[PDB]
Design a protein around this motif. Structure first.
Motif, mmCIF file in Angstrom:
data_model
loop_
_atom_site.group_PDB
_atom_site.id
_atom_site.type_symbol
_atom_site.label_atom_id
_atom_site.label_comp_id
_atom_site.label_asym_id
_atom_site.label_seq_id
_atom_site.Cartn_x
_atom_site.Cartn_y
_atom_site.Cartn_z
ATOM 1 N N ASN A 1 -87.248 17.374 73.363
ATOM 2 C CA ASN A 1 -86.501 17.298 74.629
ATOM 3 C C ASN A 1 -85.010 17.777 74.584
ATOM 4 O O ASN A 1 -84.070 16.961 74.555
ATOM 5 N N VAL A 2 -84.811 19.106 74.608
ATOM 6 C CA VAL A 2 -83.466 19.750 74.641
ATOM 7 C C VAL A 2 -83.119 20.149 76.074
ATOM 8 O O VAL A 2 -83.998 20.567 76.841
ATOM 9 N N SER A 3 -81.860 19.973 76.451
ATOM 10 C CA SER A 3 -81.517 19.958 77.879
ATOM 11 C C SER A 3 -80.865 21.240 78.151
ATOM 12 O O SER A 3 -80.326 21.816 77.198
ATOM 13 N N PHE A 4 -80.937 21.715 79.396
ATOM 14 C CA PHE A 4 -80.356 22.965 79.872
ATOM 15 C C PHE A 4 -80.312 22.917 81.388
ATOM 16 O O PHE A 4 -81.137 22.305 82.014
ATOM 17 N N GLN B 1 -83.590 20.962 82.191
ATOM 18 C CA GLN B 1 -83.797 19.840 81.284
ATOM 19 C C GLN B 1 -82.461 19.203 81.010
ATOM 20 O O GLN B 1 -81.565 19.857 80.485
ATOM 21 N N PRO B 2 -82.287 17.926 81.403
ATOM 22 C CA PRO B 2 -83.290 17.091 82.087
ATOM 23 C C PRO B 2 -83.885 17.701 83.372
ATOM 24 O O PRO B 2 -83.277 18.552 84.017
ATOM 25 N N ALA B 3 -85.085 17.262 83.734
ATOM 26 C CA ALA B 3 -85.726 17.753 84.948
ATOM 27 C C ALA B 3 -84.819 17.357 86.106
ATOM 28 O O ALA B 3 -84.294 16.226 86.154
ATOM 29 N N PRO B 4 -84.612 18.274 87.064
ATOM 30 C CA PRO B 4 -83.738 17.920 88.185
ATOM 31 C C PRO B 4 -84.350 17.068 89.319
ATOM 32 O O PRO B 4 -85.583 17.015 89.511
ATOM 33 N N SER B 5 -83.480 16.374 90.052
ATOM 34 C CA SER B 5 -83.932 15.582 91.178
ATOM 35 C C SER B 5 -83.854 16.606 92.312
ATOM 36 O O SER B 5 -82.984 17.482 92.299
ATOM 37 N N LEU B 6 -84.766 16.497 93.274
ATOM 38 C CA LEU B 6 -84.828 17.436 94.374
ATOM 39 C C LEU B 6 -84.407 16.843 95.685
ATOM 40 O O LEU B 6 -84.602 15.651 95.928
ATOM 41 N N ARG B 7 -83.840 17.693 96.534
ATOM 42 C CA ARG B 7 -83.422 17.305 97.880
ATOM 43 C C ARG B 7 -83.477 18.567 98.742
ATOM 44 O O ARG B 7 -83.154 19.666 98.270
ATOM 45 N N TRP B 8 -83.889 18.400 100.000
ATOM 46 C CA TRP B 8 -84.024 19.512 100.944
ATOM 47 C C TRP B 8 -83.010 19.459 102.080
ATOM 48 O O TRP B 8 -82.522 18.394 102.459
ATOM 49 N N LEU B 9 -82.700 20.619 102.631
ATOM 50 C CA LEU B 9 -81.806 20.668 103.777
ATOM 51 C C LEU B 9 -82.501 21.515 104.825
ATOM 52 O O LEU B 9 -83.254 22.443 104.495
ATOM 53 N N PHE B 10 -82.265 21.181 106.086
ATOM 54 C CA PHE B 10 -82.798 21.980 107.164
ATOM 55 C C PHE B 10 -81.585 22.334 108.023
ATOM 56 O O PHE B 10 -80.975 21.471 108.672
ATOM 57 N N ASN B 11 -81.225 23.613 107.982
ATOM 58 C CA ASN B 11 -80.087 24.144 108.716
ATOM 59 C C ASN B 11 -78.791 23.519 108.219
ATOM 60 O O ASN B 11 -77.910 23.205 109.015
ATOM 61 N N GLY B 12 -78.699 23.329 106.902
ATOM 62 C CA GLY B 12 -77.502 22.766 106.294
ATOM 63 C C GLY B 12 -77.342 21.258 106.257
ATOM 64 O O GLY B 12 -76.439 20.745 105.615
ATOM 65 N N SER B 13 -78.222 20.536 106.924
ATOM 66 C CA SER B 13 -78.127 19.084 106.942
ATOM 67 C C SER B 13 -79.324 18.431 106.241
ATOM 68 O O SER B 13 -80.400 19.032 106.132
ATOM 69 N N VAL B 14 -79.140 17.197 105.775
ATOM 70 C CA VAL B 14 -80.212 16.499 105.083
ATOM 71 C C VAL B 14 -81.503 16.451 105.889
ATOM 72 O O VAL B 14 -81.508 16.149 107.088
ATOM 73 N N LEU B 15 -82.597 16.769 105.204
ATOM 74 C CA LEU B 15 -83.921 16.759 105.796
ATOM 75 C C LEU B 15 -84.629 15.561 105.182
ATOM 76 O O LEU B 15 -84.848 15.524 103.973
ATOM 77 N N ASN B 16 -84.966 14.563 105.993
ATOM 78 C CA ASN B 16 -85.660 13.389 105.465
ATOM 79 C C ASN B 16 -87.154 13.610 105.555
ATOM 80 O O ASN B 16 -87.698 13.876 106.635
ATOM 81 N N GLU B 17 -87.822 13.486 104.419
ATOM 82 C CA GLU B 17 -89.249 13.714 104.392
ATOM 83 C C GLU B 17 -90.003 12.626 105.158
ATOM 84 O O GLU B 17 -89.542 11.484 105.238
ATOM 85 N N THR B 18 -91.129 13.012 105.759
ATOM 86 C CA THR B 18 -91.966 12.117 106.565
ATOM 87 C C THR B 18 -93.411 12.262 106.095
ATOM 88 O O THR B 18 -93.676 12.796 105.017
ATOM 89 N N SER B 19 -94.349 11.779 106.899
ATOM 90 C CA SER B 19 -95.757 11.911 106.549
ATOM 91 C C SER B 19 -96.211 13.334 106.919
ATOM 92 O O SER B 19 -97.237 13.816 106.433
#
Ligand SMILES: *[C@@H]1O[C@H](CO)[C@@H](O[C@H]2O[C@H](CO)[C@@H](O[C@@H]3O[C@H](CO)[C@@H](O)[C@H](O)[C@@H]3O)[C@H](O)[C@H]2NC(C)=O)[C@H](O)[C@H]1NC(C)=O
Ligand SMILES: *[C@@H]1O[C@H](CO)[C@@H](O[C@H]2O[C@H](CO)[C@@H](O[C@@H]3O[C@H](CO)[C@@H](O)[C@H](O)[C@@H]3O)[C@H](O)[C@H]2NC(C)=O)[C@H](O)[C@H]1NC(C)=O
Ligand SMILES: *[C@@H]1O[C@H](CO)[C@@H](O[C@H]2O[C@H](CO)[C@@H](O[C@@H]3O[C@H](CO)[C@@H](O)[C@H](O)[C@@H]3O)[C@H](O)[C@H]2NC(C)=O)[C@H](O)[C@H]1NC(C)=O
Ligand SMILES: *[C@@H]1O[C@H](CO)[C@@H](O[C@H]2O[C@H](CO)[C@@H](O[C@H]3O[C@H](CO)[C@@H](O)[C@H](O)[C@@H]3O)[C@H](O)[C@H]2NC(C)=O)[C@H](O)[C@H]1NC(C)=O
Ligand SMILES: *[C@@H]1O[C@H](CO)[C@@H](O[C@H]2O[C@H](CO)[C@@H](O[C@H]3O[C@H](CO)[C@@H](O)[C@H](O)[C@@H]3O)[C@H](O)[C@H]2NC(C)=O)[C@H](O)[C@H]1NC(C)=O
Ligand SMILES: *[C@H]1O[C@H](CO)[C@@H](O[C@H]2O[C@H](CO)[C@@H](O[C@@H]3O[C@H](CO)[C@@H](O)[C@H](O)[C@@H]3O)[C@H](O)[C@H]2NC(C)=O)[C@H](O)[C@H]1NC(C)=O
Ligand SMILES: *[C@H]1O[C@H](CO)[C@@H](O[C@H]2O[C@H](CO)[C@@H](O[C@@H]3O[C@H](CO)[C@@H](O)[C@H](O)[C@@H]3O)[C@H](O)[C@H]2NC(C)=O)[C@H](O)[C@H]1NC(C)=O
Ligand SMILES: *[C@H]1O[C@H](CO)[C@@H](O[C@H]2O[C@H](CO)[C@@H](O[C@@H]3O[C@H](CO)[C@@H](O)[C@H](O)[C@@H]3O)[C@H](O)[C@H]2NC(C)=O)[C@H](O)[C@H]1NC(C)=O
Ligand SMILES: *[C@H]1O[C@H](CO)[C@@H](O[C@H]2O[C@H](CO)[C@@H](O[C@H]3O[C@H](CO)[C@@H](O)[C@H](O)[C@@H]3O)[C@H](O)[C@H]2NC(C)=O)[C@H](O)[C@H]1NC(C)=O
Ligand SMILES: *[C@H]1O[C@H](CO)[C@@H](O[C@H]2O[C@H](CO)[C@@H](O[C@H]3O[C@H](CO)[C@@H](O)[C@H](O)[C@@H]3O)[C@H](O)[C@H]2NC(C)=O)[C@H](O)[C@H]1NC(C)=O
Ligand SMILES: *[C@@H]1O[C@H](CO)[C@@H](O[C@H]2O[C@H](CO)[C@@H](O)[C@H](O)[C@H]2NC(C)=O)[C@H](O)[C@H]1NC(C)=O
Ligand SMILES: *[C@@H]1O[C@H](CO)[C@@H](O[C@H]2O[C@H](CO)[C@@H](O)[C@H](O)[C@H]2NC(C)=O)[C@H](O)[C@H]1NC(C)=O
Lengths: 347, 109, 108, 347
Positions: free
Chosen positions: A246-249, A273-291
């Motif tokens: 487990n070497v990081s980059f 590495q470490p594996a990154p955490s993901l987050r999405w934006l829709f038109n520059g603002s936070v996109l909250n995931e739904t069903s």
């Protein structure tokens, strides 16, 4: 031939009588054979690989009724196959484990033999319980006698194994050094197994038997997800245990043209590495995931830190048309990628 | 098109397309009668342009065992309330509109 | 009874069931927001109790080549207009309702 | 054997020398064989069924080199298989049509033979163009000589075939008499084929050769959908033509409880001849079919007048709940069947 052997009919060499292999290797007639019957002789005490010196596809070997007593872990090394091995009615005090070395031997006859029960027979023990090599029915028993396929059980075991990774994390171009502690009582051979570390400079031989030292220097990211294993073989059996590095980059990220399948999908590929955490934006603002709009990962492929997936959109409309941005973050910082997606023309 | 998803993704048996339909003039009601569809409607003093969400086949189905089955994709409907016309009778009636595309199975031989 | 149609007719890969829903009180709008559905509405006159036509999966899929594909039936939706309470005021908005039952493919 | 035959070795009777069949049926040695070589032989002029009297399983028969001038349309009646028949270099003036009689005969050698071109050779003619029996490559020609696989063509024909059914429609328990008139210039055998007319009393032999009388007395309805065929064989080939009766009985109808497949369906079965006209009623009043509610018949089954189908409902609602009546009508009157169907509840 004929003189003392070679009868049979098919691929058979039959010499049910006194030993005469002295010239059965120089000019026997055919190094090929499939059955050898030696259930009767006067010599044969030490059976080594040399005694079998002769490439051959043999499936049946009978060495019952003879004199053999010491079969060093090697012997049948030649015959790659071998399904049935009959060494019954002999003098063999004990049969070393390594002998079979998973040769797929289907039947193994050991008996009427002194068969001094040792720890160096826990393997035949197993083979009887597990009901593997057709050991069960034979009703084997111990010489001297402490009688049989019963036996102190807990007093025979394989060696124990822990391997200490560097306690601290790691980064690219470091030296990763580590030891493999084998703790038991049988004590024979040991040695690491490298599954292709073409991308790193390994340094072993730094150990004897109580510990085995292995160090990787000037370490590339191409160490990730590459098993690093180590040996152990007591007088009866083998244990291998394996750990990873487990070497990081830094994080890297990309998005692909949106595609409509059962559901719509904005494909993405992300590494780091470490594996990154993901987050999405829709038109520059936070996109909250739904069903109906969420991230889905495909199953990770063999030895590669890269992850693939989609932002899945369940029946999206024109109100979902816009710029989608994926943000991949880890200790080093963050990577970003954007893409415009149109799912439907508006009114 | 080298993305894994193009291979390990979840696919439709039948492909559809979704659009907003706003030029609809005629339709058939719950009784199967051809009725007139207005273009606007008055929902509580608020004039609305009549629009519909419709899904239809993208013009045999995918993944079918073609050894044993004939098959094809077809557009199925839903019933939705709409301001329509039957004579001097503007009414709030249910009409038939495209809502999905399904696979129709049929044994062969 | 045994009628030729059970063998020679046109079947569905996935079985569904249509019903009339008139007790709907919540639904999600087109913005994926949860919204309140009015039990009634009224056109410059008397009131029409709000009813919805829904089709969902009836309790893999039929006719699928199981050698290359995994599969499952699932309920898909549609967007239909409805009198709702946006979390502030009464409005004619498109809500999500069950509308069909389809088959989903996934390679083996 | 041996003395004038039987060398070979395997399944073979070899006598490429001289006549010796006068006793090859009494004590040959083994009824079975597979190849017979009778190239070269003084006697043996007329090859007939009595000459192969020995139920064999032969695939190769050589009768090249001999006197064999005539081959009665029968010979090969015993041998069922036969793939290769060599009658070459001989004295055959012609080979009857029946002769072959579909034996899947793969190779037929008819060579260095007198081979006078009659109409009775059109079959050979065809085997050439068709390129079937492996005739082509031989370059067969005409004796006396008007030379070959060329030949007046259209002047040769099979027979013509008309069967006059009665002019008037038929009702059960009538007689139905009919004639089969075969016109051609070959002229050999003739005869009707009744494919199981257990349900009626037939009486033929009512004719010679210009016309063949056949009469079906006290006709049931189970005459329906039953091919009634007549024969014809000229001096080269055969023509058979088949008509049908159509006898009339009253309508019958039945409905089954509605079921939901892709569309909803009210299954129905109706019989009668003439076939009844269908009509539906919903709650006692006529149901007008549209693209969403329509009657649908399944493909008709062979040898049956009964029809199966569905009243097909494409997503009906509670408004289609009610009593469905199917009305089946023909010249005898009308049959009726009703059923209650509920596709949806209705608040
Ligand atoms: C060093 O390399 C490890 C490779 O084996 C790796 O471990 C990680 O494994 C996966 C992601 O690669 C994650 O594990 C999670 O486990 C939970 C519970 O089982 C699951 O619900 C979840 O789906 C996921 O599989 C973690 O990110 C992590 N697992 C661990 C060890 O917690 C890491 O890169 C790193 N692991 C170490 C030693 O910390
Ligand atoms: C989705 O939004 C992204 C950010 O809002 C946008 O990213 C980039 O957009 C363009 C190039 O794709 C660039 O914008 C320019 O940046 C320069 C340098 O600062 C300015 O001088 C110029 O005025 C303009 O802003 C940037 O690379 C970046 N946008 C910024 C400034 O943050 C994506 O382009 C967008 N999706 C797409 C591709 O339409
Ligand atoms: C003897 O009785 C037969 C059974 O009632 C009757 O069947 C035929 O009916 C008509 C005759 O013109 C034809 O039916 C048509 O078939 C085609 C397809 O083959 C359809 O496209 C068309 O719509 C129509 O159904 C057929 O020739 C045949 N149909 C049946 C019932 O199989 C005969 O007409 C009748 N003939 C005599 C000797 O009177
Ligand atoms: C080092 O070697 C491999 C990595 O290159 C690892 O492998 C593993 O593969 C899977 C885990 O992803 C497992 O496969 C065995 O288990 C499955 C399910 O129980 C069985 O179908 C079958 O027994 C598979 O052989 C194992 O975890 C492992 N495979 C094996 C048995 O080698 C391997 O795990 C890794 N070293 C270890 C053991 O840590
Ligand atoms: C008596 O025997 C059969 C009915 O019992 C009939 O047969 C024929 O059946 C079909 C008619 O449906 C004929 O035509 C099919 O084959 C042609 C190829 O030449 C295709 O165009 C197509 O598939 C037709 O449907 C067949 O030629 C024949 N079948 C056989 C035995 O091969 C037969 O017609 C009937 N006698 C009559 C004419 O009343
Ligand atoms: C490897 O050689 C073994 C020794 O010859 C052989 O043993 C078996 O020998 C025969 C096989 O037919 C059987 O002997 C039995 O003996 C009892 C006791 O008298 C009889 O009652 C019985 O009828 C039978 O003759 C046994 O199967 C077995 N006997 C023993 C213990 O030696 C192995 O079978 C042989 N390995 C292989 C290839 O199977
Ligand atoms: C029935 O007898 C036919 C003649 O006896 C025979 O024809 C074949 O005869 C022989 C096969 O043994 C071959 O002909 C040869 O031709 C060469 C010249 O190229 C000569 O040198 C040689 O002596 C011999 O005549 C041919 O295979 C063929 N004759 C030709 C050339 O047409 C049939 O095959 C036989 N039928 C069977 C299969 O039983
Ligand atoms: C849907 O309506 C059908 C009416 O067309 C009905 O048919 C039958 O209704 C009853 C019960 O089966 C019976 O009606 C008879 O009508 C005669 C008229 O003079 C009376 O004299 C007699 O006493 C009786 O009431 C018949 O069996 C039949 N009606 C006729 C004559 O057409 C269906 O039953 C109904 N749906 C169902 C299956 O309930
Ligand atoms: C080793 O050499 C051969 C194997 O290569 C052995 O042989 C025998 O092989 C099988 C058993 O291994 C015998 O049984 C077969 O036939 C039975 C029918 O009763 C079936 O159940 C199945 O097909 C078995 O595989 C064969 O009969 C026999 N082979 C022959 C000659 O046909 C051989 O016995 C063995 N030599 C020894 C005794 O050590
Ligand atoms: C009657 O006698 C035989 C009945 O089975 C047949 O013969 C032929 O058999 C095969 C058919 O292609 C050919 O034989 C050749 O192939 C075999 C198989 O590998 C080899 O032994 C060798 O290459 C043979 O030459 C011949 O066409 C013929 N066999 C021979 C050479 O006599 C056939 O049905 C018929 N015999 C004939 C041709 O009159
Ligand atoms: C020692 O012998 C014991 C005898 O029971 C072994 O225990 C196993 O016994 C069965 C295997 O044949 C199974 O029940 C289990 O694998 C195990 N028993 C349980 C459930 O605990 C044991 O494996 C042998 N080896 C040692 C020393 O552990
Ligand atoms: C007679 O033999 C000829 C071979 O030349 C067959 O071929 C025909 O080819 C054409 C058909 O469209 C036409 O040219 C003729 O019908 C015919 N050829 C000629 C001129 O004979 C033909 O089928 C045979 N005729 C018979 C008896 O069926």
């Amino acid at each position: 031939c004929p003189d003392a052997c070679c009868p049979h009919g098919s691929s058979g060499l039959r010499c049910t009588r006194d030993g005469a292999l002295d010239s059965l290797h120089h000019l026997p007639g055919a190094e090929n054979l499939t059955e050898l019957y030696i259930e009767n002789q006067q010599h044969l005490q030490h059976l080594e690989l040399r005694d079998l010196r002769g490439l051959g596809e043999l499936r049946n070997l009978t060495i019952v009724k003879s004199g053999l007593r010491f079969v060093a872990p090697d012997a049948f090394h030649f015959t790659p196959r071998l399904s049935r091995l009959n060494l019954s009615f002999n003098a063999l005090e004990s049969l070393s484990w390594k002998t079979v070395q998973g040769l797929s031997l289907q039947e193994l006859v050991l008996s009427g033999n002194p068969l001094h029960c040792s720890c160096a027979l826990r393997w035949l023990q197993r083979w009887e319980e597990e009901g593997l090599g057709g050991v069960p029915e034979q009703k084997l028993q111990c010489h001297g006698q402490g009688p049989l396929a019963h036996m102190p059980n807990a007093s025979c075991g394989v060696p124990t194994l822990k391997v200490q990774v560097p306690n601290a994390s790691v980064d690219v171009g470091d030296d990763v050094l580590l030891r493999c502690q084998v703790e038991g009582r049988g004590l024979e051979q040991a040695g690491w197994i490298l599954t292709e570390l073409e991308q790193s400079a390994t340094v072993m031989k730094s150990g004897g038997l109580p510990s085995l030292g292995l160090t990787l220097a000037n370490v590339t990211s191409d160490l990730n997800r590459k098993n690093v294993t180590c040996w152990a073989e007591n007088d009866v059996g083998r244990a291998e245990v394996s750990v990873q590095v487990n070497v990081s980059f830094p994080a890297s990220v990309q998005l692909h043209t949106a595609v409509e399948m059962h559901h719509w999908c904005i494909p993405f590929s992300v590494d780091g590495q470490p594996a990154p955490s993901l987050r999405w934006l829709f038109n520059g603002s936070v996109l909250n995931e739904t069903s109906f709009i969420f991230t889905e990962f495909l199953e990770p492929a063999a030895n590669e830190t890269v992850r693939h997936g989609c932002l899945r959109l369940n029946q999206p409309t024109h109100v979902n048309n816009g710029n989608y941005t994926l943000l991949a973050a880890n200790p080093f910082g963050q990577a970003s990628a954007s893409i415009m997606a149109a799912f439907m023309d508006n009114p | 098109s080298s993305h894994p998803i193009f291979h390990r993704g979840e696919f439709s048996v039948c492909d559809s397309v979704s659009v907003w339909v706003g030029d609809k003039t005629t339709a058939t009601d719950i009784k199967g009668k051809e009725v007139m569809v207005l273009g606007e409607v008055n929902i509580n003093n608020s004039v609305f342009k009549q629009y519909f969400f419709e899904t239809k086949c993208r013009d045999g189905c995918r993944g079918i065992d073609s050894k044993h089955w004939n098959s094809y994709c077809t557009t199925t409907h839903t019933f939705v309330k709409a301001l329509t016309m039957d004579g001097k009778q503007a009414a709030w009636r249910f009409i038939r509109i495209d809502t999905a595309c399904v696979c129709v199975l049929s044994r062969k031989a």
